[PDB]
Every structure is written in structure tokens, then in C-alpha cells.
Nucleic acid binder design. Structure first.
Length: 319
DNA sequence: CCGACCGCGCATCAGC
DNA sequence: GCTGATGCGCG
DNA sequence: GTCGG
């Protein structure tokens, strides 16, 4: 409906973040693009959009110019500037942030090919990001997710039956396609007052059956890496998977949190306020304005009960 | 007018 | 070698 | 860049 405007804003956001290294402007722009995309009328002026939360005076000028001229002068000058367009592109490589990008580009490294020539100048995460540059930008069709979940839940169940695993993200809301695979893991012998190699044991199994192919980073609670579905002798693209081990007594707060949507938790985090509780990523604690101890949570329903809110199916949690 | 705008786990580096 | 800072990715 | 205290 307003495809141009939201593209323009998203270009602007990518540029403040990657090139100006001004992350707050980056979120301001995308915030603005977020609300404008969710606007059931074709915007007809800057002023019109100004009535929106997240759209201020400056973005309003840009919308008038884009509407009037079909382009934005600021963006043009930016696209025809090799430095900032080459820094902006390099960040598409996982492991290359604003700072690394600019660094490379200062010393001539501008392209994927320049990166291959210089593999010896990238860290491990970066090498892997370079390797799977195309694959990481692909979306994961649901029926692959489904198939991926099956192996992950299946291989966890096989290390120790007490393991609990939940693939969250938009996928848990039944979105047709995901961007990565986010699994939350926990285990009875693991609380806020508590085994030695719980995550490891599971990452290994998944490696042992050739499902996990590369590790970006791995510690006692968070795993970031790459996986791939087996094929029938045209191989599947490689995909990003995170795996997070969480204490059992905060597990379900976790699940609720990493299921979103961002907006659903917003209207919930800030509805539980009305009713006298503070929800966060870890716990639901009561308010006295001082927060008491965390309450027991045995499921997602429990959290919904505390704020006496009707339970909302992950699917219907779009907002 | 002026500061907030999430803040955390892991990898790596800067400074001893 | 150790400790704290920084970069990066991510709900 | 936009917001709200």
C-alpha cells in the first residue's frame, strides 16, 4: 500500500545503523516504517503520516518529497557514494557489524570476493557467515521448520527424556515461514538454585546425527549455529539455529517471551502493570512500586491467570 | 530542553 | 595470564 | 529521529 515510503525509511534505517552507527535513529526509522506499513490507507502527505506515533517532522518532510518527486535526494547521494554503500552491504554478512564493515572498507575489502581473498582477516563467526551468505538470507518455509522441529525434539528426547524443548518465534504462532530456528530448552535438575553439560550434551547429539553443521558460538546457556535438513540423494540450504538452556522456574516466562509477537508482549507486559504485576523475560513478579519475589510459573496459562487475562493461543498473539 | 531509546551471552581484544 | 571493554546478534 | 517527562 505504501511500499515506496516504507522501503525509503528502511533504507534510511539501514544507513543510520550501518554507516552513521547511530542505532537509535535506526530504530526510529524502522519504528516509523512499521506503523506506516500497518496503515490501511495510501498516505497522501507528510502531515497525514505525522499523526502517527513514530512519525515526526523530519520523516514528514521526507514523505512529501518522496510523494512529490518519486525519490529522496538524501538517499540518492548515499547510493552513489561507494564507501557508505560498500559498508552497508558488508554488514549483511553475519559477524560483520558496522565497525568491522567500515574497517574492511577503509582497507579495500569491499565485496564478498574481497572477503574470500582475505579469509585470514575474518574471525570464525564471520567466516561462517561468509560461507552461507546466500543461505542465511533465505526464509525457512514452515514445512521445513516442521521437519526441523521433528529432528530437534526427537534428538533431545533421546539424550534424556527429562529435557523439554520448544521451538518458538513466529513459527510457534503458525507463521508460514521463519527466518531462523529458536529452541528453548530446560531440564528439571536446572533451576535458579542449581547440571554440568546440559546444553553440550544436546548440541553434540545434533552434531552426531549431522543436523548441526557449524558453531557460531557456544556456551553453557546459549548456542548459536548452523543446521541443515537431510536430502534424498538437491541438498537443502543451511539455516541458522539458536538453542537456549533456561532454568525450569523461568522456562515458561521464556517461552511466552520468545513467542511474541513483540506487540503482544507489549500490550501484555503493560497490561499486567494495570493489574499489579511486572512481567519480564525471566519472571512474573508482583508490585508493592517495589517488586516482590517471582511467582511460581508451571505453564504459560499461569502467567495469563495472574493478570486474570484470558489465555491467548500463540497464533492469535499477533498483537 | 534533554535523556531514553533492552540489555544480555559469547568471542575477541585492549590494557595492563 | 587476568579483568574489564567492545563488537555483534537478537525478542 | 521521535518521544515524553
Amino acid at each position: 500500500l505504501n511500499g515506496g515510503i516504507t522501503d525509503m525509511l528502511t533504507e534510511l534505517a539501514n544507513f543510520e545503523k550501518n554507516v552513521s552507527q547511530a542505532i537509535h535513529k535506526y530504530n526510529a526509522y524502522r519504528k516509523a516504517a512499521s506503523v506506516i506499513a500497518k496503515y490501511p490507507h495510501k498516505i497522501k502527505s507528510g502531515a497525514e503520516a505525522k499523526k502517527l506515533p513514530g512519525v515526526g517532522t523530519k520523516i514528514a518532510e521526507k514523505i512529501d518529497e518522496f510523494l512529490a518527486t518519486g525519490k529522496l535526494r538524501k538517499l540518492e547521494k548515499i547510493r552513489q557514494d561507494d564507501t557508505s554503500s560498500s559498508i552497508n552491504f558488508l554488514t549483511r554478512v553475519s559477524g560483520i557489524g558496522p565497525s568491522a564493515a567500515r574497517k574492511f572498507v577503509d582497507e579495500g575489502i569491499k565485496t564478498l570476493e574481497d572477503l574470500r581473498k582475505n579469509e585470514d582477516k575474518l574471525n570464525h563467526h564471520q567466516r561462517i557467515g561468509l560461507k552461507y551468505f546466500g543461505d542465511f538470507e533465505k526464509r525457512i518455509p514452515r514445512e521445513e521448520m516442521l521437519q526441523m522441529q521433528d529432528i530437534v525434539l526427537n534428538e533431545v528426547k533421546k539424550v534424556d527424556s527429562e529435557y523439554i524443548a520448544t521451538v518458538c518465534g513466529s513459527f510457534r504462532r503458525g507463521a508460514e515461514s521463519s527466518g531462523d530456528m529458536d529452541v528453548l530448552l530446560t531440564h528439571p535438575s536446572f533451576t535458579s538454585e542449581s547440571q554440568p553439560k546440559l546444553l553440550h550434551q544436546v548440541v553434540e547429539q545434533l552434531q552426531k546425527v549431522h543436523f548441526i553443521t557449524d558453531t557460531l558460538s557456544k556456551g553453557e546457556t546459549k548456542f548459536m549455529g548452523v543446521c541443515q535438513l537431510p536430502s534424498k540423494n538437491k541438498e537443502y540450504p543451511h539455516r541458522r539455529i539458536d538453542i537456549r538452556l533456561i532454568p525450569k522456574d523461568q522456562y515458561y516466562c521464556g517461552v511466552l517471551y520468545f513467542t511474541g509477537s513483540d506487540i503482544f508482549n507489549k500490550n501484555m507486559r503493560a497490561h499486567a502493570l494495570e493489574k499489579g504485576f511486572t512481567i519480564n523475560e525471566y519472571t512474573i513478579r508482583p508490585l508493592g512500586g517495589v517488586a516482590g519475589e517471582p511467582l511460581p510459573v508451571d505453564s504459560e496459562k499461569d502467567i495469563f491467570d495472574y493478570i486474570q487475562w484470558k489465555y491467548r493461543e500463540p497464533k492469535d498473539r499477533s498483537e
